[PDB]
C-alpha cells in the first residue's frame, strides 16, 4: 500500500543506513574543512579600518 | 479519509518531527548568526553624519 | 523515532539520485567560486597581494 513499495522493514533498514551515512559524510566534511583551515584560515580577523 | 493519505497517528508523528526539525534548524541559525556576529558585526552603529 | 516512515512515501532511490545531482552542482559551484578568487585560489600563483 505504500507508494514506494517498501515494507516498513526495508524502510527501517534504509533509514538506519541513510542516517548513518549522512552523519558520516558530514563528519568527513568537517575533518576536510579543518584540514583546509590549517592550510588556509579563510575567515580573516576584522581589518583595522573595518566597521 | 485524509487528503494526504496519512492516518491520524502518522499525521501526529509527522507534526512532531516537522516542528522539532524546524525549531532545531532555527535555533542553530540563531547560534550561527551569533558566531558570525562575533566574526563580523554586520549592522554598524549610526555613523557620525547620519540623519 | 517514526522518521523511517518518510521512506514509505519518498522512494529512497529517486531521493538519492536527485540529492546526488544537487550536491554535485553545489560542489562545482563552490570549487569554481573559490578558484575565481585571488585569496583562496589553490591552482594559480598567488595574486592580489604584494
Amino acid at each position: 500500500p505504500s507508494l514506494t513499495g517498501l515494507t516498513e522493514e526495508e524502510a527501517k533498514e534504509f533509514h538506519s543506513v541513510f542516517v548513518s551515512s549522512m552523519v558520516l559524510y558530514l563528519a568527513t566534511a568537517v575533518i576536510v574543512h579543518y584540514l583546509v583551515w590549517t592550510a588556509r584560515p579563510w575567515i580573516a580577523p576584522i581589518p583595522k579600518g573595518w566597521v | 479519509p485524509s487528503l494526504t493519505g496519512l492516518t491520524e497517528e502518522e499525521a501526529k508523528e509527522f507534526h512532531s518531527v516537522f516542528v522539532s526539525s524546524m525549531v532545531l534548524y532555527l535555533a542553530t541559525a540563531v547560534i550561527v548568526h551569533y558566531l558570525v556576529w562575533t566574526a563580523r558585526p554586520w549592522i554598524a552603529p549610526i555613523p557620525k553624519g547620519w540623519v | 523515532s517514526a522518521s523511517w516512515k518518510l521512506w514509505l512515501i519518498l522512494d529512497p532511490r529517486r531521493v538519492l539520485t536527485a540529492l546526488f545531482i544537487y550536491l554535485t552542482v553545489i560542489a562545482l559551484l563552490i570549487h569554481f567560486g573559490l578558484l575565481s578568487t585571488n585569496r583562496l585560489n589553490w591552482w594559480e600563483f598567488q595574486r592580489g597581494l604584494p
Binding site: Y34, A39 | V17, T28, L35, A39 | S1, S3
Partner: peptide, 28 residues
C-alpha cells in the same frame, strides 16, 4: 598560523557541527 584556537574557526565548525549532532539525535 591557522590553529584550533582561531576564534573564527568556530563559525565553520558551528554550521557544520551543530546539525550533524541533532541530525543524529532526532531522526535516528
Amino acid at each position: 598560523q591557522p590553529s584550533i584556537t582561531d576564534w573564527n574557526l568556530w563559525v565553520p565548525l558551528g554550521i557544520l557541527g551543530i546539525p550533524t549532532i541533532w541530525i543524529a539525535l532526532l531522526y535516528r
